[PDB]
Design a protein around this ligand. Structure first.
Ligand code: NA
Ligand code: NA
Length: 416
């Protein structure tokens, strides 16, 4: 039995050995900056592999999932998924705002316009490794292209392309076959990378622990951890199971038990995109969910649905505002809530710590962007829990959308 699940136990042992090695090296050894950088080399290699595999997986899976569905019922399923994601994000934002205000632990228009611009890129080839940003200048607007994959535009193009080739009929069957084969090949390559994962996980955790030097910053920011962790726990244990139970009259915790494999995997990597194959297997096999709904809903949720991220950012922005003793009125609460939801619509193909999402909210509330370094220390610990919450929300949404589309799925069975 151990051989079949050998990757999971190996990764758990890697986590244990990483904590031990990091603590022992930090306490009993002295390292310079260059030596600390060279210590985390295998973790850097693992991250490069995952970033490499993101693009083909996302594009091919999106096209295949959209083209599988019939054109009659494609719109309703997408609308239901969008509504669920929007509602969950709003509830998470409200919960985070309420908790951060109660506990008290301590332009933007251009960013929104850039967000809309990135949905319709000028060039498809450039959109695979570059993004678009605008800045003011003495007032004249000037645009520039910066490195970083544009997952928002590629997802929109993939959705439209999949619909077009699924409506065409026999004339576009060769394209469907091409992208199905590409998706299968990408999943197999992801498995091959997951074979090597444990060593990268070991060295990543070891490097994470060693970096902290003072070790009193954790004690100072103890209240800040409690707010974020309590919000994530309440959202994961209370709100999401209750929403699932209201729509689907089943046991919400049996679904989580079936998805436990992908949940713990998502904790390991802390990447929602890289957990797509495990999530597919767990949803289709353990929970007996339909493949047609799953293959289409899950990639969209990975790119779009970010409950833990919205909660995390909102709490951090309010905490930073409280650090500076800046007053926050009723309007300030709303504009932080609204900006947090729409800050980073798509950031799935980017598996590393992004401070730009915080910077948008900071600019909207009118605070300097140099306050990020104060709390940049604990991101390495909080990000894994945030990604786990995101993956859990996606998994719950798959079943919720599947239940609500019984008539559409029955209509799709007579044409098969
Ligand atoms: Na949501
Ligand atoms: Na997600």
């Amino acid at each position: 039995f151990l051989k079949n699940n050998w990757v999971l136990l190996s990764t758990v042992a890697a986590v244990v050995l990483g904590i031990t090695t990091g603590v022992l090296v930090r306490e009993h050894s002295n390292l310079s900056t260059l030596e600390k950088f060279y210590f985390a080399f295998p973790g850097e290699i693992l991250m490069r592999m995952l970033k490499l595999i993101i693009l083909p997986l996302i594009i091919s899976s999106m096209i295949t999932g959209v083209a599988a569905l019939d054109s009659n019922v494609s719109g309703k399923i997408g609308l239901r998924a969008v509504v669920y994601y929007f509602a969950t994000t709003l509830i998470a934002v409200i919960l985070g705002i309420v908790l951060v205000v109660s506990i008290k632990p301590g332009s933007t228009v251009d960013a929104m316009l850039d967000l809309i611009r990135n949905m319709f890129p000028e060039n498809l080839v450039q959109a695979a490794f570059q993004q678009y940003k605008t800045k003011r200048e003495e007032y004249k607007i000037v645009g520039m292209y910066s490195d970083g994959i544009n997952v928002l535009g590629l997802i929109v193009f993939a959705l439209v392309f999949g619909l077009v080739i699924g409506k065409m009929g026999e004339k576009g069957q060769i394209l469907v076959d091409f992208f199905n084969a590409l998706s299968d090949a990408t999943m197999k390559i992801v498995q091959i990378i997951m074979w090597y994962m444990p060593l990268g996980i070991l060295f990543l955790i070891a490097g994470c622990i060693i970096e902290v030097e003072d070790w009193e910053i954790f004690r100072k920011l103890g209240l800040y951890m409690a707010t974020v962790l309590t919000g994530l726990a309440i959202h994961s244990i209370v709100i999401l199971p209750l929403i699932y139970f209201i729509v689907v009259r089943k046991n919400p915790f049996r679904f989580a038990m079936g998805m436990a494999q992908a949940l713990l995997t998502a904790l390991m990597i802390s990447s929602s995109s890289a957990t797509l194959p495990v999530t597919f297997r767990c949803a289709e096999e353990n929970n007996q969910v339909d493949k047609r709904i799953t293959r289409f809903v899950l990639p969209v949720g990975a790119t779009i649905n970010m409950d833990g991220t919205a909660l995390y950012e909102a709490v951090a922005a309010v905490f930073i505002a409280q650090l500076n003793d800046l007053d926050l009125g009723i309007g300030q609460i709303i504009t932080i809530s609204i900006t947090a939801t729409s800050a980073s619509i798509g950031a799935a193909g980017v598996p590393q710590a992004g401070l730009v999402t915080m910077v948008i909210v900071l600019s909207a509330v009118g605070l300097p962007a140099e306050d990020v370094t104060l709390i940049i220390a604990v991101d390495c610990l909080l990000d894994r829990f945030r990604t786990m919450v995101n993956v859990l929300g996606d998994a719950f949404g798959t079943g919720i959308v599947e239940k609500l589309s019984k008539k559409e799925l029955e209509q799709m069975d007579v044409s098969s």
